[PDB]
Design a protein around this ligand. Sequence first.
Ligand SMILES: *[C@@H]1O[C@H](CO)[C@@H](O[C@@H]2O[C@H](CO)[C@@H](O)[C@H](O)[C@H]2NC(C)=O)[C@H](O)[C@H]1NC(C)=O
Ligand SMILES: *[C@@H]1O[C@H](CO)[C@@H](O[C@@H]2O[C@H](CO)[C@@H](O)[C@H](O)[C@H]2NC(C)=O)[C@H](O)[C@H]1NC(C)=O
Ligand SMILES: *[C@@H]1O[C@H](CO)[C@@H](O[C@@H]2O[C@H](CO)[C@@H](O)[C@H](O)[C@H]2NC(C)=O)[C@H](O)[C@H]1NC(C)=O
Ligand SMILES: *[C@@H]1O[C@H](CO)[C@@H](O[C@@H]2O[C@H](CO)[C@@H](O)[C@H](O)[C@H]2NC(C)=O)[C@H](O)[C@H]1NC(C)=O
Ligand SMILES: *[C@@H]1O[C@H](CO)[C@@H](O[C@@H]2O[C@H](CO)[C@@H](O)[C@H](O)[C@H]2NC(C)=O)[C@H](O)[C@H]1NC(C)=O
Ligand SMILES: *[C@@H]1O[C@H](CO)[C@@H](O)[C@H](O)[C@H]1NC(C)=O
Ligand SMILES: *[C@@H]1O[C@H](CO)[C@@H](O)[C@H](O)[C@H]1NC(C)=O
Ligand SMILES: *[C@@H]1O[C@H](CO)[C@@H](O)[C@H](O)[C@H]1NC(C)=O
Ligand SMILES: *[C@@H]1O[C@H](CO)[C@@H](O)[C@H](O)[C@H]1NC(C)=O
Ligand SMILES: *[C@@H]1O[C@H](CO)[C@@H](O)[C@H](O)[C@H]1NC(C)=O
Lengths: 87, 428, 98, 98, 50
Amino acid sequence: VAVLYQGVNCTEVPVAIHADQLTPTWRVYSTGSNVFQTRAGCLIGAEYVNNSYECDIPIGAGICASYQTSQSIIAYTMSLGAENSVA
Amino acid sequence: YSNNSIAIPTNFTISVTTEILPVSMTKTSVDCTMYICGDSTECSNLLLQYGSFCTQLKRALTGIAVEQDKNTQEVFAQVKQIYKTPPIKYFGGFNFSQILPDPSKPSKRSPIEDLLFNKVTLADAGFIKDLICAQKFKGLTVLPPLLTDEMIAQYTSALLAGTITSGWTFGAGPALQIPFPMQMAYRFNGIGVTQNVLYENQKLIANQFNSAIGKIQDSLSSTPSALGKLQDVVNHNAQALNTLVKQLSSKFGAISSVLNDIFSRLDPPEAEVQIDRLITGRLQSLQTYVTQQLIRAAEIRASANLAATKMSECVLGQSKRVDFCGKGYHLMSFPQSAPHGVVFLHVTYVPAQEKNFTTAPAICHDGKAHFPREGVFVSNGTHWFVTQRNFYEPQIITTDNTFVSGNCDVVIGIVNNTVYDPLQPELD
Amino acid sequence: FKGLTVLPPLLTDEMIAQYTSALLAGTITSGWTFGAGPALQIPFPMQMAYRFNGIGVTQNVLYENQKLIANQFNSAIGKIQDSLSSTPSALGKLQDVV
Amino acid sequence: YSNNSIAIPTNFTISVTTEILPVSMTKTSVDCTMYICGDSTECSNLLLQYGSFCTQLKRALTGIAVEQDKNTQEVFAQVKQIYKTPPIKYFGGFNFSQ
Amino acid sequence: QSLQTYVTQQLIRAAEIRASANLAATKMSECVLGQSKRVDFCGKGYHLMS
Ligand SMILES: *[C@@H]1O[C@H](CO)[C@@H](O[C@@H]2O[C@H](CO)[C@@H](O)[C@H](O)[C@H]2NC(C)=O)[C@H](O)[C@H]1NC(C)=O
Ligand SMILES: *[C@@H]1O[C@H](CO)[C@@H](O[C@@H]2O[C@H](CO)[C@@H](O)[C@H](O)[C@H]2NC(C)=O)[C@H](O)[C@H]1NC(C)=O
Ligand SMILES: *[C@@H]1O[C@H](CO)[C@@H](O[C@@H]2O[C@H](CO)[C@@H](O)[C@H](O)[C@H]2NC(C)=O)[C@H](O)[C@H]1NC(C)=O
Ligand SMILES: *[C@@H]1O[C@H](CO)[C@@H](O[C@@H]2O[C@H](CO)[C@@H](O)[C@H](O)[C@H]2NC(C)=O)[C@H](O)[C@H]1NC(C)=O
Ligand SMILES: *[C@@H]1O[C@H](CO)[C@@H](O[C@@H]2O[C@H](CO)[C@@H](O)[C@H](O)[C@H]2NC(C)=O)[C@H](O)[C@H]1NC(C)=O
Ligand SMILES: *[C@@H]1O[C@H](CO)[C@@H](O)[C@H](O)[C@H]1NC(C)=O
Ligand SMILES: *[C@@H]1O[C@H](CO)[C@@H](O)[C@H](O)[C@H]1NC(C)=O
Ligand SMILES: *[C@@H]1O[C@H](CO)[C@@H](O)[C@H](O)[C@H]1NC(C)=O
Ligand SMILES: *[C@@H]1O[C@H](CO)[C@@H](O)[C@H](O)[C@H]1NC(C)=O
Ligand SMILES: *[C@@H]1O[C@H](CO)[C@@H](O)[C@H](O)[C@H]1NC(C)=O
């Protein structure tokens, strides 16, 4: 899974979910790695890449997420279509 | 009115008009256990009775939120190729610099999209979190749209580039290029005027179009009521949220509106009836909110379907439906983006300066009756000519203009004249 | 006496009649031209030729059958007059609102 | 059906038919304090403790009320010119008296 | 509760009437002020006038 916190700066999440008195299985999704900051909030558990594909699961504000190939969940910026020019 | 008098225009005018349409509304989210019981643990256990309602309200709001994104996608994302306009901007004398993107500005928006974006005043600028604070403290959230406002501008840019470089061919297959002054000739032929009218009045038509665009720009700034349709959406949503929030300071008959105050000062078995009174009141408030939102969402959906149809039929084609794409005879349209909506610019043809003539239905020449192929017979008092019906341009009557049918004993208002037969001088 | 009242509309029943009479006069004296610019007059039996030509029939078929078409049109109008009256409901779409 | 046969009409008919459409409904107004309570002064003071259950009803009903007028205007007020038909009612044999 | 039920029913009926009124306006524009080629829109047959 990946977790999205909708209104916080996940530099400052461990102080919002009160990460200190949670189960050691919830603390993996508080600081961890793969931290990424979006405009809708910010996201923990998914890796950001530089390719552009078409949307699979809409995260918001232009960002989408997917599961593909070792396997993991990736997040990316959706593409609008091919590029072309008339002569 | 008379029965042998006809009026024909000798002149024309190019007209540009606008049309505003809403597309989407604001997306919202709610959490009952925060809205109803705030931060009490005693009220949570009591609310846990009514455990099948909040699921239902949440489902309703989620459905609305997804439908908004679907609306926007249906309207704008019609074509899946990002065309570009050539770097040399010369299109036969027409001057599109007011609708094409402006690279100097940090946001690549055209000069008119800036006026549209400044004339609509919003509420929540920035989604990283005031009328947006207390709500968040009360359990109500506003979600950001999926397509940022710099993606919609790319879509409209693609549509404009395609239309002005290829015509209507890019909406029905692969794009095929064609010179612009030779596409306007096709459109003229499509509304019923021969195509040699354009090539002989080209520089007049270009000037009329440019002046019309200038007026469109100047007019929007004045009369600050053009954008009413798009401001009403914002006003409605803000007002609904304010009412919902402020509804939390009513007792609905209990002794107080503070949960801890009710729990203390009373013994449990009668404090619980007061608490249930409060809970029912707040649940009813939420349900009223959700019902009103559902009805408004239905209205917005009807509007968005209309906008999608106009995109398909006026921008990517040339319609013959009357008054669908503006007043006059439609020539062509251009889209522009606006907050929560879309704006269409319709370019149309209007006849200008008419004159009187006398007319007849047929001509009797040698016992035969001749009728026009594609025109109408007119007379200026002494001579008879044949002309096209939308623009005065007289010519001689010949066997190539007319066709024969029967004899001239049966038609009511037939008249006498001569038909030329353009073969005598060439052979003789 | 209980607190429920009805408000009057803005356009009276005598203004809507004026609007419809204007539409009819315009259409029968100028055709489709008055809806897309200034009104331009044209004889009526020379307007029907345009409309026939528009549905795919040559325009001499009208000028050679004009008096038959006139009678057929008149008879059809009379039948409308009779049928609207002597059918049972015919208007249940507007009665339902009330 | 066959592969070298065709049928072509030799005559015609002019048909007139009708179509009915609703355009608007009735405009209503309601007064809570007289519907719910009536002429009782003790009732109103108890009713005040519900935050706003009549401001909302009033707004809803007023929205409906103005929407009806917008509907009628959009349907009928197409052309802002009042044309009239000439005094002599001869239109080539067609009879528009009805 | 009685009043709220009344108002909700009114809102829904108003929406339906509005859909009908929009249809009527389109028919006015396209059948009366012009000549239509859409099939079975302006009556059954080949449209001449309305
Ligand atoms: C047809 O209409 C056009 C529209 O103006 C007329 O063009 C104007 O005509 C004269 C000729 O120079 C000037 O008053 C104006 O400069 C023209 N327009 C512009 C924008 O400059 C044209 O003259 C009309 N044709 C006839 C025969 O009347
Ligand atoms: C196309 O339209 C634009 C907008 O009116 C014209 O730009 C103006 O043209 C000159 C050039 O500086 C000046 O009169 C104005 O200052 C310009 N305005 C702006 C905002 O740049 C343009 O000239 C028109 N045609 C061409 C060929 O440029
Ligand atoms: C009606 O129009 C015709 C065609 O223009 C006019 O006849 C021509 O008038 C011109 C005017 O200079 C003469 O030079 C020509 O000799 C006439 N025709 C021919 C074939 O020679 C006619 O004068 C017009 N009538 C009125 C009353 O204006
Ligand atoms: C058109 O010409 C025909 C034949 O040239 C005219 O038909 C004759 O009209 C005269 C009236 O002046 C009658 O006396 C004859 O009986 C008609 N038939 C003939 C001569 O065969 C016809 O009148 C002319 N159309 C007009 C004047 O509008
Ligand atoms: C046009 O239609 C009207 C309506 O049918 C005709 O009016 C009738 O005329 C006859 C002959 O005078 C009377 O007996 C009927 O009573 C009239 N009907 C009505 C309803 O008044 C009219 O004659 C037709 N023709 C013309 C030229 O108006
Ligand atoms: C979140 O807060 C930090 C505070 O150090 C700030 O630097 C950062 O820009 C904030 N996030 C966003 C998206 O602005
Ligand atoms: C993505 O691209 C940026 C520059 O375009 C680069 O600095 C960054 O390292 C890249 N990241 C990944 C994960 O490829
Ligand atoms: C047509 O001619 C008549 C003759 O008097 C005149 O009154 C009328 O104004 C003319 N129409 C136009 C449009 O010039
Ligand atoms: C028409 O269809 C069938 C063929 O199976 C038969 O009637 C006849 O052979 C065909 N005629 C022609 C000209 O193809
Ligand atoms: C059918 O054709 C006949 C002969 O042409 C004629 O009566 C008319 O055209 C048609 N019938 C009717 C009743 O109009």
